[PDB]
Protein backbone atom coordinates (compact mmCIF):
# COMPACT_ATOMS: atom_id res chain seq x y z
CA UNK A 1 0.00 0.00 0.00
CA UNK A 2 1.06 3.59 -0.65
CA UNK A 3 2.12 5.98 2.11
CA UNK A 4 0.45 9.38 2.50
CA UNK A 5 1.88 11.96 4.90
CA UNK A 6 0.83 15.51 5.78
CA UNK A 7 3.38 18.05 7.01
CA UNK A 8 2.99 21.01 9.35
CA UNK A 9 3.21 23.40 6.38
CA UNK A 10 -0.40 22.49 5.53
CA UNK A 11 -2.83 25.42 5.63
CA UNK A 12 -5.96 23.25 5.77
CA UNK A 13 -7.73 24.25 2.55
CA UNK A 14 -9.36 20.84 1.83
CA UNK A 15 -8.27 21.12 -1.82
CA UNK A 16 -6.38 17.82 -1.78
CA UNK A 17 -9.49 16.15 -0.34
CA UNK A 18 -11.76 17.89 -2.86
CA UNK A 19 -9.50 16.45 -5.59
CA UNK A 20 -9.13 12.93 -4.16
CA UNK A 21 -11.19 10.44 -6.23
CA UNK A 22 -11.17 7.49 -3.80
CA UNK A 23 -12.10 9.03 -0.40
CA UNK A 24 -8.58 8.41 0.86
CA UNK A 25 -8.07 11.80 2.52
CA UNK A 26 -10.04 13.55 5.25
CA UNK A 27 -9.75 16.71 7.37
CA UNK A 28 -9.21 16.76 11.13
CA UNK A 29 -9.31 19.86 13.37
CA UNK A 30 -5.81 21.20 14.02
CA UNK A 31 -4.25 24.26 15.67
CA UNK A 32 -1.59 25.38 13.19
CA UNK A 33 -3.33 27.46 10.51
CA UNK A 34 -6.15 29.99 10.34
CA UNK A 35 -8.56 27.24 9.29
CA UNK A 36 -7.43 25.15 12.31
CA UNK A 37 -7.42 21.93 10.29
CA UNK A 38 -4.90 19.56 8.72
CA UNK A 39 -5.15 16.84 6.10
CA UNK A 40 -5.48 13.22 7.20
CA UNK A 41 -5.08 9.87 5.43
CA UNK A 42 -6.92 7.14 7.35
CA UNK A 43 -7.89 4.93 4.40
CA UNK A 44 -4.55 4.41 2.69
CA UNK A 45 -5.90 1.04 1.54
CA UNK A 46 -7.92 2.87 -1.16
CA UNK A 47 -5.03 5.06 -2.38
CA UNK A 48 -4.08 4.37 -6.00
CA UNK A 49 -1.41 7.07 -6.18
CA UNK A 50 -2.80 9.22 -9.00
CA UNK A 51 -1.15 12.25 -7.30
CA UNK A 52 -4.39 14.25 -7.61
CA UNK A 53 -3.81 15.52 -4.08
CA UNK A 54 -0.25 16.77 -4.66
CA UNK A 55 -1.43 18.52 -7.83
CA UNK A 56 -3.98 20.43 -5.71
CA UNK A 57 -1.61 21.75 -3.03
CA UNK A 58 -1.02 25.50 -2.57
CA UNK A 59 1.95 25.75 -0.19
CA UNK A 60 5.53 26.33 -1.33
CA UNK A 61 6.32 22.76 -2.34
CA UNK A 62 3.90 20.08 -1.18
CA UNK A 63 2.52 19.83 2.33
CA UNK A 64 1.05 16.39 1.53
CA UNK A 65 3.38 13.74 0.12
CA UNK A 66 2.54 10.44 -1.56
CA UNK A 67 5.20 7.72 -1.69
CA UNK A 68 4.34 4.77 -3.92
CA UNK A 69 4.90 1.34 -2.40
CA UNK A 70 3.95 -2.33 -2.67
CA UNK A 71 1.19 -2.28 -5.28
CA UNK A 72 -1.87 -4.45 -4.61
CA UNK A 73 -5.14 -5.18 -6.40
CA UNK A 74 -6.69 -2.01 -4.96
CA UNK A 75 -3.66 0.22 -5.54
CA UNK A 76 -3.19 -1.06 -9.10
CA UNK A 77 -6.69 0.20 -9.92
CA UNK A 78 -7.79 -3.23 -11.13
CA UNK A 79 -11.47 -3.33 -12.11
CA UNK A 80 -11.50 -6.76 -13.79
Amino acid sequence: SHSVKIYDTCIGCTQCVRACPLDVLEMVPWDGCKAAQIASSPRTEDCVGCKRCETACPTDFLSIRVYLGAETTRSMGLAY
Binding site: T14, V17, C20, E26, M27, W30, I38, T44
Partner: peptide, 25 residues
Protein backbone atom coordinates in the same frame (compact mmCIF):
# COMPACT_ATOMS: atom_id res chain seq x y z
CA UNK B 1 -18.25 6.67 1.97
CA UNK B 2 -19.26 8.83 3.66
CA UNK B 3 -17.10 7.78 6.62
CA UNK B 4 -18.50 9.56 9.70
CA UNK B 5 -21.75 10.59 7.99
CA UNK B 6 -20.11 13.82 6.79
CA UNK B 7 -18.24 14.30 3.53
CA UNK B 8 -14.43 14.21 3.97
CA UNK B 9 -14.21 17.69 2.38
CA UNK B 10 -15.26 19.87 5.30
CA UNK B 11 -13.78 19.21 8.75
CA UNK B 12 -15.61 17.24 11.44
CA UNK B 13 -15.26 16.38 15.11
CA UNK B 14 -14.32 12.82 15.97
CA UNK B 15 -11.50 11.98 13.54
CA UNK B 16 -7.96 10.79 14.23
CA UNK B 17 -4.80 12.27 12.69
CA UNK B 18 -3.50 9.61 10.28
CA UNK B 19 -0.18 10.09 8.52
CA UNK B 20 0.37 13.44 10.23
CA UNK B 21 4.00 14.57 10.55
CA UNK B 22 5.49 17.35 12.67
CA UNK B 23 8.23 18.48 10.27
CA UNK B 24 8.87 19.91 6.82
CA UNK B 25 9.70 17.86 3.74
Amino acid sequence: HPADGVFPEKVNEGREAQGTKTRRI
